[PDB]
Amino acid sequence: TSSIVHLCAISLIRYWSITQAIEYNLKRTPRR
């Protein structure tokens, strides 16, 4: 299991700069 996490983490960072825009995006809104 721990082997997963591992893989996850790895794949997390690289996949970081996205979340930010996930929702926001999703929404957006703006808001505003």
Coil vs helix vs strand at 2:
helix
Backbone break loci in the chain, preceding residues, C–N > 2.5 A: none
Way it was determined: NMR
Distance of alpha carbon 22 from alpha carbon 6, whole angstroms:
23
The total of other beta-carbon atoms located within 10 Å of residue 10's CB is 10
Distance of alpha carbon 1 from alpha carbon 3, whole angstroms:
5
